[PDB]
């Protein structure tokens, strides 16, 4: 019945789409932020990809490595790993029912499944652990087991950190929520089914080339979060 | 000593960078064009990737398939394949010394290696070969076996189908060549070493975000060649 | 009900399991045999994977390359083919044969992989590998070359074997029992002229 | 010169090949054994690949999944670890141990893969798989559990075996000869408690 938003700080918000977008539960689990880096320059994507931004040539080129691909592996040594943990949430209210991971489950006793994937790669230089650098990305995947809702459409502005509800009868604003950190994901949970909300939407010969070029720029976001440059794309 | 340009018609030009960019050899081998398609809509990239352009949402999303990945494989059947043939050219003059492929070499008797890769996938619907659709991409890779030249820099304009030489002493135009078809690749062959020429170049806080966003749009080209929409990227 | 048999020379024979073993049809498609080679002896497979042998060492060990992953870059050429030959179930009669260039007007899907090293300056071949296997959707003794009331013999060694029935398609072939199963689970024969592995 | 031996319980012993076989050091790193499991019997490997067995069928056949490719999506959890434990060559003495969270202040690189199925509603584990192998850069009888003048016995079964010498690191272990090599080229033992495959 509600809306789930995954921000870059690694947190999960949940809004009741009627009337207010009034927050119904926040879930902060310490897990870090959704993207990290120590150390032209390399820009991590939310997926796990890295991109090389040459500042001298004004170019962005794909490095042929991933955080995972680096783990497959001169002078340095690669460490790190990929993890999958699932949080059994009680939608709604709250809450954590369990935290399931590789070494064990952590249960509380008393319908929303929330999986965090985390990929870390740390480059260390022998004969020591002085860490020459690292990259670490993460994201949430969501499942419920018991478009947009009728009367109201839900959109998401990446560059504005805003979720918004518009009436299909007027297009006008019904409610709005501003977040204090960049948005990485957004799901609309409705009548049992989980529905992913796109971050990239605009709606109301050599013509269609511009239309398709207009489309290709519309489908990439480059943001900054607490000093970390990252890259969202489709 | 010269410059090699691979166009979308599947041809290979070669220019003497001094003084003129005067063409020295054209190589037309029937092999088709560098990208083809029969049949929202799907846009092939030069690599082999496909992209889905939703015209209603003004969005470009990655399909999780490649021309090769489709071959790995309901109602339809996939056929096609990937081929690697090498043309032993005589740089310079001309020419073909041999054409080496899977089933055999085709020799002439009397220093430039030119490999064409070709990826085709055809979707056919049983019980017949009426071909529900197809995609076919190709590209050239170049090797010589016996930046830019001194005094002169070589650049390439994708959207203008132009190769250009500029003096390092003034930045001014030394010579220029206009092609009649979109450019897919460009190599600068100099003193034994083969040097790939980038298709994307411009040269002369929240600041660097725009600088890096300016960079990320600079590194993608969406063109059209004889009706076929394609996509160049880094 | 029909019995389709993929031989290791590239041709496809069909038998009637109606207490005959008689051949109703047999198809040769000029793509070559399922295994080819050239001039530390190494052995390929149906896949095609690659394996390295020496008679002094006790072992057979994987080479970190495949025919395919060699195409992804001495000069290497070749490629991969996916061709489906449409048959009418009984007595063959190819209806459509669609390859990469286009379709010519029970379907046998023929995969072929080929890599050859050639002299950069000359073009002269240094060595090669060609691997293929059949797939076609609508008890055999691999020791010798027979399918078994009734039996049937080849020329050439067997590669794959399916049994059609009613429309459905069926292919067929303490820790001691476990290890014993692993033993008789890989096959290494000869063709011609060359060692080949049939995996599992 | 040193002899480093990776046992199948996760610990690493070193022997002096100076006509002793004596243990100079031995390292246990709490990451678990190299193979774990849970409750059509299937068998994993060091990689870790997965294989399916039934005592009625003559065979051992690949399942189209790995511990890793199951992580890439009953509910599945777990992950993959890459940890390198820096040792001083003789007598161990771990200098640095860098995992994904950070480095704590001859290097053993420990890979671990883990997948477990859990009940969606409950969280209760349904089954799991854990696979690990050691790698560390700066004649053994796998039949029994010994390395051979002098010999040495384990508890537990052997997984990998290297021989250090002068600085360099060396690990060691008609068509009849070919097929014979393929035979004694895979190992299927028991631990504990579970069948495991050591590939090649
Ligand atoms: W480095
Ligand atoms: W379709
Ligand atoms: W060689
Ligand atoms: W099950």
Count of domains observed in chain C? 1
Cα–Cα distances (Å) from B222 to A175, B37, B44, B45, B68, in that order, read 37, 16, 10, 9, 22
State residue C178 phi and psi, 5-degree precision: -65, -55
Beta bridge partners of A118: A83, A138
Which of D86, D120, D123 lies nearest to residue A107, judging by beta carbons?
D123
Q: What is the rounded CA–CA span in Å between residue B13 and residue B189?
A: 13
Helix and strand tally (H, E) in chain C? 2, 19
3-state secondary structure at position B167:
strand
Q: How far apart are CA B32 and CA B166, in angstroms?
A: 33
Spatial CB neighbours of B229, under 8 Å, sequence gap ≥ 6 = A208, A209, A212, B41, B43, B44, B53, B222, B223
Chains touching D (3+ CB pairs < 8 Å): A, C
Residue pair C36/C130 in contact (Cβ under 8 Å)? The answer is yes
- Distance between alpha carbon A220 and the CA centroid of its chain, in Å? 14
> Looking at chain D, which residue has its C-alpha nearest residue C187?
D179
A127–chain D Cβ distance below 8 A for any pair: yes
CA distance A135 to A120: 6
Q: Which chain A positions have a beta carbon within 8 Å of D82's beta carbon?
A: 71, 78-81
A33 contacts A10 by C-beta, under 8 angstroms: yes
Taking the Cβ of residue D86 and every Cβ of chain A, the question of whether any pair is shorter than 8 Å is answered with yes
Q: Is A113 on the interface with D (CB under 8 A)?
A: yes
For residue B118, give the nearest of B22, B35, B206, B210 by alpha carbon: B35
The reply to whether D91 touches chain C by the CB within 8 Å rule is no
Name the strand (E) or helix (H) holding A67. Answer: helix A67-71
| CB-based contact, C83 to chain B, within 8 Å | yes
Cα D92 to chain center, whole Å? 20
The answer to whether residues D81 and D112 touch, using CB atoms and an 8 Å cutoff, is: yes
DSSP assignment letter at B120? E
CA distance readout (Å), C199 to C160, C181, C184, D62, D140: 11, 13, 11, 10, 27
Question: Which 8-state DSSP code applies to residue A29?
Answer: -
**Residue D192, Cβ density class (10 Å: 0-12 exposed, 13-18 middle, ≥19 buried):** exposed
Cβ–Cβ under 8 Å, residues A67 and A121: yes
Q: Let me know if B141 is exposed, middle or buried by CB neighbors in 10 A (0-12, 13-18, 19+).
A: middle
| Residue in A195, A227, A176, A210 with CA at minimum distance from that of residue A41 | A227
Task: Mark A66-95 as b/e (b = at least 16 C-beta within 10 Å).
Answer: bbbebbeeeeebbbbbbbbbbbbbebeebe
The CA dihedral of D121, D123, D127, D132, to the nearest 10 degrees, is: 140
What Å distances lie between residue B33 and A127, B120, B225, C18, CA to CA?
Answer: 54, 12, 9, 52
Ligand nearest to the CA of A65: 1
Cis peptide before B160 (omega within 30 of 0): no
Q: Which residues of D touch C190 (CB under 8 A)?
A: 175
Q: Which residues of C fall within a CB distance of 8 Å from B81?
A: 79-82, 99-100
Least Cα distance to C112 among C85, C78, C138 occurs for C78
Strands (DSSP E) found in chain A:
3-7, 12-16, 22-23, 35-38, 41-44, 49-54, 59-66, 77-89, 96-100, 105-107, 112-124, 133-144, 152-157, 162-167, 173-178, 183-190, 193-196, 220-225, 228-233
Strand C140-141 and strand C158-165: the pairing is unpaired
Asked whether C88 and C95 are in contact (CB, 8 A), the reply is yes
Distances (CA, A) of A10 to A29, A33, A119, A183, D71: 8, 5, 14, 10, 21
Instruction: Determine which of B212, B213, B222, B234 to mutate to test the interface with A (most A C-beta atoms within 10 Å).
Output: B212
Question: How many inter-chain contacts (C to D, CB under 8 Å) are there?
Answer: 67
Ligand closest to B132 (CA) is 2
Which chain C residues touch B107 with a CB distance below 8 Å? 123
Q: Considering only CB atoms, which chain D residues are within 8 Å of A129?
A: 86, 96-98, 102-105
**Tokens 């199948």 correspond to what residue?**
D8
- Sequence length of chain C is 200
Per the structure block, which two tokens stand in for A53? 């931004």
Q: Are B33 and B18 in contact (CB under 8 A)?
A: no
Question: Residue A46 in contact with residue D55, Cβ under 8 Å?
Answer: no
Sequence-distant (≥ 6) Cβ neighbours of residue A211 within 8 angstroms: B55, B58
DSSP class per residue in A164-184: EEEETTTS-EEEEEE-SS-EE
Ligand 2 centroid from CA C147, angstroms: 39
The DSSP secondary-structure symbol of B197 reads: P
- Listing DSSP states for B124-157 in one string gives E-TTTT--SEEEEEEEEEEEE-----TTEEEEEE
Instruction: Take residue C115 and report the two structure tokens written for it.
Output: 């890599």
Q: In whole angstroms, give the CA distance from residue C77 to residue C90.
A: 38
What is the extent of the structural domain holding B234?
1-234
Strand-pairing partners, residue D176, are: none
Interface test with C, best of D179, D187, D194 (most C CBs within 10 A): D179
Question: B97 and chain C: CB distance < 8 Å anywhere?
Answer: yes
Q: Which two tokens stand for residue C74?
A: 């001495």
Q: Is D126 on the interface with A (CB under 8 A)?
A: no
Q: Label residue C78 left, alpha or beta by phi (over 0 means left) and psi (-120 to 50 means alpha).
A: left
Between CA A200 and CA A206, with CA A201 as vertex, the angle to 5 degrees is 100
Identify whether the C-beta of residue C60 lies closer than 8 Å to the C-beta of residue C51.
Answer: yes
Kindly determine whether residue C100 and residue B120, on different chains, have CB atoms separated by under 8 Å: yes
Q: How far is the CA of D111 from the centre of ligand 4 (A)?
A: 27
* Short-list A212, A222, A208, CA closest to B222: A212
Question: What experiment produced this structure?
Answer: X-ray
CA nearest to B128, candidates B74, B72, B76, B71: B76
The answer for residues whose C-beta is within 8 angstroms of residue A47's C-beta and 6 or more apart is A66, A137, A139, A233
Q: Are D180 and D186 in contact (CB under 8 A)?
A: no
- Indicate yes or no: CB of D53 within 8 angstroms of CB of C181: yes
Cβ atoms of C53 and C43 within 8 Å: the answer is: yes
Please name which of C176, C178, C198 lies closest in space to residue C188, comparing C-alpha atoms. Answer: C198
Residues 6+ apart with CB under 8 A from A13: A4, A5, A7, A23, A25, A26, A27, A179
CB-based contacts of D166, cutoff 8 Å, min separation 6: D1
- Cα D65 to ligand 4 centre (Å): 13
Helix (H, G, I), strand (E, B) or coil at A217: helix
Q: For residues A114 and D120, what is the distance between their CA atoms, to the nearest angstrom?
A: 11
- If you search the block for the tokens 């932020």, which residue do you land on? A33
**Contact across the interface for C53 and D179, Cβ inside 8 Å:** no
**Which of A67, A60, A53, A223 has its CA nearest to residue A138?**
A67
Q: Give phi and psi for B214, each to the nearest 5.
A: -65, -35
**Cited resolution, angstroms:** 3.1
Closest alpha carbon to C82 in B173, B71, B21, D126: B71
> How far, in Å, are B54, C124, C190 from residue C38 at the CA level?
50, 13, 14
- Helix-strand-coil split of chain D, %, nearest 5: 5, 50, 40
Give the CA radius of gyration of chain C: 19
For residue B133, give every residue at least 6 positions away whose Cβ sits within 8 Å of its Cβ, in sequence order, or none.
Answer: B37, B38, B39, B122, B123
Pick from B92, B122, B73, B82: nearest CA to B27:
B92
Q: Position of tokens 């001039």?
A: C39
Distance (Å) of CA C50 to CA C41, C72, D47:
11, 15, 18
- Residue corresponding to tokens 């149906």: C46
Chain-centroid distance of CA C117 in Å reads 22
CA angle B74–B77–B81, rounded 5-degree value: 140
d(CA C182, nearest CA chain D) in Å: 5
Between the CA of D66 and the centroid of ligand 4 the distance, in Å, is 15
Q: What are the C-alpha distances in Å from A171 to residues A154, A158, A165, A187, B13?
A: 11, 19, 9, 21, 54
Backbone angles phi, psi at B68, to 5 degrees: -70, -40
Separation between Cα atoms, residue B132 and residue A159, nearest integer Å:
41
Residue D119, token pair as written in the block: 């009940």
Q: How many residues does chain B have?
A: 234
Is D50:D70 a contact under the CB 8 Å cutoff?
Answer: no
Token pair for D69: 């490719």
User: Using alpha carbons only, what angle is made at residue D110 by residues D104 and D116, rounded to the nearest 5 degrees?
Assistant: 105
What angle is formed at CA A79 by the lines to CA A78 and CA A83, rounded to 5 degrees? 135
- Whether the CB-CB separation of C186 and D51 falls below 8 Å is answered with no
**C2 is written with which tokens?**
């029909």
DSSP state string for D115-177: EEEE-TTT--EEEEEEEEEEEEE--EETTTTEE----EE-SS-EEEEEEEEBTEEEE---HHH
């Amino acid at each position: 019945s509600l809306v789930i938003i995954s921000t870059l700080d690694g947190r999960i918000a949940a809004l009741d789409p009627e009337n207010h977008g009034k927050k119904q539960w926040d879930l902060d689990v310490g897990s870090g932020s959704l993207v990290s880096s120590s150390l032209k320059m390399i820009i991590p994507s939310l997926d796990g990809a890295l991109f090389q931004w040459d500042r001298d040539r004004e170019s962005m080129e794909t490095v042929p490595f991933t955080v995972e691909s680096l783990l497959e592996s001169d002078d340095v040594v690669l460490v790190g790993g990929k993890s999958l943990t699932t949080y059994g949430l009680s939608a709604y209210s709250g809450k954590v029912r369990y935290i399931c991971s590789a070494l064990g489950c952590r249960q509380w006793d008393s319908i929303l499944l929330l999986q965090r994937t985390q990929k870390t790669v740390r480059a260390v230089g022998p004969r020591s652990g002085n860490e020459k650098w690292n990259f670490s990305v993460g994201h949430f995947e969501l499942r419920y087991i018991p478009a947009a809702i009728m009367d109201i459409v839900i959109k998401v502005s990446v560059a504005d950190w805003k979720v918004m509800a518009f009436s299909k009868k007027g297009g006008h604003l019904e409610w709005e929520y501003q977040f204090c950190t960049p948005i990485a994901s957004a799901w609309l949970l409705k009548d049992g089914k989980v529905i992913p909300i796109s971050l990239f939407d605009d709606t109301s010969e050599e013509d269609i080339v511009e239309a398709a070029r207009g489309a290709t720029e519309n489908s990439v976001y480059l943001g900054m979060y607490r000093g970390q440059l990252y890259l969202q794309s489709s």
